[PDB]
């Protein structure tokens, strides 16, 4: 029933609307969700999907970029 990426009991929903960090983080928060945790997803198959989308630390998952827009995943436990 996870319409997105399923990993270790969590469900990652792709939001393809480009948003600034605050707006993305607030969007997930309202959906009872968080942004992805960089260290959780970095050494998994999820990295190919989540790369250069907003992490919970405020940066794109891998110069200053806090004023730019990125896509984002909302993460919610099952």
């Amino acid at each position, epitope marked *: 029933s996870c319409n997105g990426l399923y990993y270790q009991g969590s469900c990652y929903i792709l939001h393809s609307d480009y948003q600034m960090f605050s707006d993305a983080a607030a969007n997930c928060t309202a959906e009872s969700s968080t942004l992805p945790n960089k260290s959780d997803v970095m050494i998994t198959w999820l990295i190919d999907y989540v790369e250069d989308t907003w992490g919970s630390d405020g940066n794109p998952i891998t110069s200053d970029v*806090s004023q730019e827009v990125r896509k984002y995943f909302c993460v919610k436990t099952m």
Partner: antibody
Amino acid sequence: VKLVESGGGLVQPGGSLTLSCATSGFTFSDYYIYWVRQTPEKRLEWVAYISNSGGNTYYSDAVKGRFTISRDNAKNTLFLQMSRLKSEDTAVYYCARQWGGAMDYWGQGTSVTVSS
Amino acid sequence: DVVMTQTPLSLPVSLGDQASISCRSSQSLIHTNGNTYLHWYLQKPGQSPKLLIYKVSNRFSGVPDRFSGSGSGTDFTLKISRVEAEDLGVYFCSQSTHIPPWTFGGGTKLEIKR
């Protein structure tokens, strides 16, 4: 790095006006850009903000629904379409490039005056 | 709706003296990314604003050692170790942590003391 505003002039209330901001010395489509105005009180007030591609736009509450920020990446030019102009919109209008979280390079400005 | 409050409005300084300008935000400017997005601009008469210091304490290109930014959270300071004639004009602090809107301090006019 250069940014040059133009199109500033005298308009009547309810009138319309388009400002331009020609750029030089950097790859234009790689940079997000602001419009910032300086009031007669000489205060700085943010107006609008556009993404590098132009897919995202943001407006201050005071110009929301009246002003339109757009860009032409082929012409290295930024635009500010102003409609339903009020005396409150009287200002010097600056375009400013975003870098490092800040506004690193500004044009010389173009002057707008709304009066009957 | 982050209010930037600058003091003083005018700062009378003589040449060679140190100057310090205060800028205070209505809420903390610490970004979840660890950085703090407070910036300082200088506007000379008949000129547009130019960037002096970005992210609290980083001097922009061509900006001399005598300008130093500091502070944290809600309280920030611009220091000019020794005031020169070319420094005269209006200094503006700005925040880009809680956006939109991007907001500016009211400004501090550096002036000659006689």
